[PDB]
Amino acid sequence: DRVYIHPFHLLYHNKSTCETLPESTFEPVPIQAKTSPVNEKTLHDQLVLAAEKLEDEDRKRAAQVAMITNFVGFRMYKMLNEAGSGASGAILSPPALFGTLVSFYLGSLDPTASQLQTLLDVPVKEGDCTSRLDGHKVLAALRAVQGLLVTTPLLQSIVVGLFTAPGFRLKHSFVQSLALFTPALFPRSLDLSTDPVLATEKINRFIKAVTGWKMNLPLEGVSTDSTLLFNTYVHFQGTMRGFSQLPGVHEFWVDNSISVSVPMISGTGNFQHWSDAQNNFSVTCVPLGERATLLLIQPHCISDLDRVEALIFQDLLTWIENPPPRAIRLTLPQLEIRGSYNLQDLLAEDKLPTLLGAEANLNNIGDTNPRVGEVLNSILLELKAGEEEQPEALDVTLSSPFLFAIYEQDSGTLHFLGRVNNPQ
Amino acid sequence: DRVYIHPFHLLYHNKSTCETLPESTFEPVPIQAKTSPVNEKTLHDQLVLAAEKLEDEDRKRAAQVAMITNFVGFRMYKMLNEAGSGASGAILSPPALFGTLVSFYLGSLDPTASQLQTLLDVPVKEGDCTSRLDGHKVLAALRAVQGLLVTTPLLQSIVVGLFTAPGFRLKHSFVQSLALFTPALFPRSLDLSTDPVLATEKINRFIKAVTGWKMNLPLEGVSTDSTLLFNTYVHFQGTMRGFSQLPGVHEFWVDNSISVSVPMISGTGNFQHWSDAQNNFSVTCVPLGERATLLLIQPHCISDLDRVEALIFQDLLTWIENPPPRAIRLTLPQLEIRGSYNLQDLLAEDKLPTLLGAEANLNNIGDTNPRVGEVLNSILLELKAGEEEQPEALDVTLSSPFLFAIYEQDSGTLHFLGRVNNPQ
Ligand code: NA
Ligand code: NA
Ligand code: NA
Ligand code: NA
Numbered sequence: 001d002r003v004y005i006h007p008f009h010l011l012y013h014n015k016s017t018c019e020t021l022p023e024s025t026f027e028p029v030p031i032q033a034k035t036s037p038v039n040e041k042t043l044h045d046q047l048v049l050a051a052e053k054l055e056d057e058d059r060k061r062a063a064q065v066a067m068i069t070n071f072v073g074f075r076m077y078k079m080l081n082e083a084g085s086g087a088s089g090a091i092l093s094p095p096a097l098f099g100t101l102v103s104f105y106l107g108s109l110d111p112t113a114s115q116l117q118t119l120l121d122v123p124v125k126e127g128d129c130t131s132r133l134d135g136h137k138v139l140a141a142l143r144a145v146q147g148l149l150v151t152t153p154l155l156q157s158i159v160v161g162l163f164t165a166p167g168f169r170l171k172h173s174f175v176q177s178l179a180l181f182t183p184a185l186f187p188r189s190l191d192l193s194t195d196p197v198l199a200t201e202k203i204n205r206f207i208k209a210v211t212g213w214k215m216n217l218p219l220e221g222v223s224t225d226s227t228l229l230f231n232t233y234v235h236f237q238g239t240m241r242g243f244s245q246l247p248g249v250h251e252f253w254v255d256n257s258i259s260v261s262v263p264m265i266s267g268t269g270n271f272q273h274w275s276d277a278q279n280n281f282s283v284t285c286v287p288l289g290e291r292a293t294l295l296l297i298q299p300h301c302i303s304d305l306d307r308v309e310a311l312i313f314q315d316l317l318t319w320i321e322n323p324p325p326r327a328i329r330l331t332l333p334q335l336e337i338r339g340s341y342n343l344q345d346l347l348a349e350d351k352l353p354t355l356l357g358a359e360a361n362l363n364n365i366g367d368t369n370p371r372v373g374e375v376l377n378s379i380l381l382e383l384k385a386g387e388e389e390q391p392e393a394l395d396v397t398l399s400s401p402f403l404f405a406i407y408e409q410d411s412g413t414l415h416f417l418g419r420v421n422n423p424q
Numbered sequence: 425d426r427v428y429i430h431p432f433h434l435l436y437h438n439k440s441t442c443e444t445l446p447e448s449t450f451e452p453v454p455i456q457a458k459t460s461p462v463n464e465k466t467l468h469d470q471l472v473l474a475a476e477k478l479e480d481e482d483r484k485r486a487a488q489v490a491m492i493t494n495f496v497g498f499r500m501y502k503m504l505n506e507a508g509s510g511a512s513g514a515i516l517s518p519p520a521l522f523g524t525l526v527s528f529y530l531g532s533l534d535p536t537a538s539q540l541q542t543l544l545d546v547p548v549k550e551g552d553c554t555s556r557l558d559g560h561k562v563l564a565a566l567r568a569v570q571g572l573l574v575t576t577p578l579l580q581s582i583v584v585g586l587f588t589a590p591g592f593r594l595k596h597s598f599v600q601s602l603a604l605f606t607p608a609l610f611p612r613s614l615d616l617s618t619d620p621v622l623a624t625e626k627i628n629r630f631i632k633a634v635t636g637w638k639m640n641l642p643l644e645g646v647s648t649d650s651t652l653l654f655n656t657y658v659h660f661q662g663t664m665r666g667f668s669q670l671p672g673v674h675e676f677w678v679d680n681s682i683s684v685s686v687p688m689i690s691g692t693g694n695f696q697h698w699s700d701a702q703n704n705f706s707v708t709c710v711p712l713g714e715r716a717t718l719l720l721i722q723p724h725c726i727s728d729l730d731r732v733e734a735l736i737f738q739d740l741l742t743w744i745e746n747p748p749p750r751a752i753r754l755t756l757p758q759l760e761i762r763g764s765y766n767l768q769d770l771l772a773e774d775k776l777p778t779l780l781g782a783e784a785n786l787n788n789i790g791d792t793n794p795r796v797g798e799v800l801n802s803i804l805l806e807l808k809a810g811e812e813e814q815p816e817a818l819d820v821t822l823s824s825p826f827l828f829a830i831y832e833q834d835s836g837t838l839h840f841l842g843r844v845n846n847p848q
């Protein structure tokens with residue numbers, strides 16, 4: 001019934017740890033300040049160092065962070081579908097959402113700190129700090145699983161834009177904590193309280209410029225009394241080794257009566273594929289690198305999609321199986337998936353409208369208690385055909401709505417889940 | 425002739441190391457703020473951890489920091505004697521003076537940074553940062569030699585009081601560097617520019633209160649335009665295992681015609697003792713712990729004291745010898761030695777009146793270039809008889825002026841040198 005996670009290796013172990021130097025602060029530079037674009041290869045090459053040498057302890061921590069990441073991802077994915085999110089489908093990144101939540105937790109104090117911990121499904125003992133998550137162990141374990149994911153060009157980049165009102169000063173230890181989540185961190189100041197819509201225009205133009213990513217960011221304005229926005233931007237890029245684009249276009253059914261003609265990619269490899277008898281769906285796994293897997297889930301028929309989605313995406317992956325690979329001809333739409341949601345909305349959908357509300361104790365973020373506006377998570381996920389265009393096998397053809405997940409075998413972390421209703 | 429030290433292990437090795445977050449700062453709390461006294465046992469127990477586990481590399485660094493510490497100590501001891509320092513004698517701590525100099529170096533930029541490096545006798549290549557000292561390696565190597573020194577109650581405590589004018593903000597990375605020199609670091613703000621004498625009264629009362637040390641601090645006022653004072657306070661405490669106080673009092677000759685009757689301690693042990701034939705002085709070494717040694721140097725006669733002092737305290741310890749220990753009855757004054765000097769005065773005596781002068785680039789200390797007043801080093805050195813009062817051996821009796829040094833065998837670091845002219 002009520003599942004609890006007991007991530008012992010991510011807790012504080014020294015009661016004493018939890019007559020003081022005043023904490024140091026800085027003022028972020030204005031959003032207009034000249035900034036070099038993020039180098040996605042420099043980020044990659046680093047994350048790869050941070051997964052290279054790992055003792056047994058590190059893998060124990062990475063296994064426990066995986067469980068909390070997945071569970072919270074499943075819960076927020078459920079919140080996402082209840083709020084409704086565009087016709088093309090849904091997409092969510094548990095590592096990014098989880099990273100966001102842990103960043104706030106690092107800036108928070110009670111009651112907010114234990115409320116974030118409860119959300120994450122870890123028990124709290126009122127009075128006992130050694131039952132509390134150590135956010136630094138958590139972010140460090142999350143960095144390692146990001147590293148394991150990306151071991152030809154296989155990219156995942158997380159960028160954080162931290163937008164504050166003029167005069168709001170950030171605490172040093174807070175921002176140094178955020179660097180563990182991602183080194184690509186841009187604290188910037190701008191006038192939030194006079195033209196919400198142009199403030200969003202500035203953030204969108206800023207993000208496009210430091211990343212070069214074509215993301216379709218939301219255009220809605222910031223609430224005029226916001227002093228802190230915390231936006232997380234995710235770029236995933238994979239190549240399908242040996243898949244190439246097929247000639248012309250092919251029917252993809254949006255539902256039983258409506259089709260769209262789209263470009264498909266196709267490839268033949270040794271993949272794993274099974275049919276689930278109990279619930280009547282099938283699954284295909286294609287490797288993206290040495291540790292990453294793409295899972296493609298097909299309902300037997302279109303009207304069974306919601307039932308299947310709710311089975312499989314909601315807390316262990318009881319349904320992942322490990323059959324012998326077999327010769328498979330896989331045909332699917334080239335995936336260029338864009339998504340964005342405000343964590344505030346998902347939290348409100350989860351009956352926690354005020355967790356990050358006006359009374360949240362976030363006093364470890366800066367010099368005053370911030371007043372948090374949006375907390376966006378945005379994704380660009382790109383699966384590219386590994387080859388240009390121009391033997392017995394089983395045909396799997398994704399020509400109607402399906403679900404997908406990108407998954408890392410060692411930790412068990414789901415890095416993405418989603419649903420394609422209409423590629424376009 | 426011109427000696428140069430080439431401490432390769434203390435330099436920067438990565439040229440790249442030497443589009444930026446604004447640096448974080450804080451305002452120190454006012455000098456009146458309620459402060460718990462330093463725990464000298466908590467400091468000791470830590471320094472002892474920091475010397476416990478040390479790879480070969482660490483000892484290589486510690487050997488090189490020793491050379492720079494000794495040489496600069498010898499040079500400043502010479503500066504001290506040229507300026508003249510009270511009738512009872514002289515005392516200087518090379519580790520404390522060196523630590524002070526390196527702290528400034530960490531806060532400095534060119535030309536000041538290379539001028540501090542030149543002072544320390546290390547070559548500089550204009551343009552090449554990999555010829556520069558890495559202050560963090562330096563302070564860390566200095567921490568380890570402090571640790572080796574203190575391995576029954578054998579104490580050495582270094583406290584730093586960093587006194588700034590109201591509104592002057594310290595940089596975070598600067599103060600975190602200073603913590604490597606000593607964790608007992610008290611940045612405090614007070615009005616310097618209205619009553620220099622009461623400002624010194626406040627600092628003296630502050631220091632007495634956080635330490636409990638009876639130090640006889642200087643009473644001179646701060647120059648009215650000072651915004652930064654950097655004062656280092658040193659407490660050394662040793663017990664002479666098996667020495668006890670002798671009945672009554674005994675003649676100590678201040679020069680050939682004048683004596684003072686003082687209490688002496690005395691003890692019989694296996695100590696090392698030799699006569700230097702070439703220069704006609706003798707030396708006795710008594711162990712203070714497992715790594716520390718006291719060296720007692722006697723000139724053959726009182727008028728030869730200056731000559732001998734200048735031979736022995738000015739850059740290698742060519743004159744330290746290692747004979748078989750022998751039965752020695754050592755009689756000497758109980759030593760309670762107090763000393764204080766302003767590094768500014770010694771620097772001016774060394775023809776560097778402006779190294780830390782008004783134009784010194786110290787922009788990595790805080791938000792404005794500080795204007796440095798005094799840089800005091802003060803010492804309380806206490807050698808206690810190891811027992812209360814009530815067998816053939818050689819009598820060594822220190823009944824006229826002599827020199828002393830406290831020395832650590834592994835690194836070769838001199839932690840104190842001095843001269844006793846009059847114990848009182
Ligand atoms: Na652990
Ligand atoms: Na801090
Ligand atoms: Na385990
Ligand atoms: Na924490």
Ligand code: NA
Nearest residue numbers: 432433434481
């Ligand atoms: Na080295």
Ligand code: NA
Nearest residue numbers: 447448596597
């Ligand atoms: Na900093």
Ligand code: NA
Nearest residue numbers: 483484485487
């Ligand atoms: Na060597």
Ligand code: NA
Nearest residue numbers: 530557558559
């Ligand atoms: Na340095």
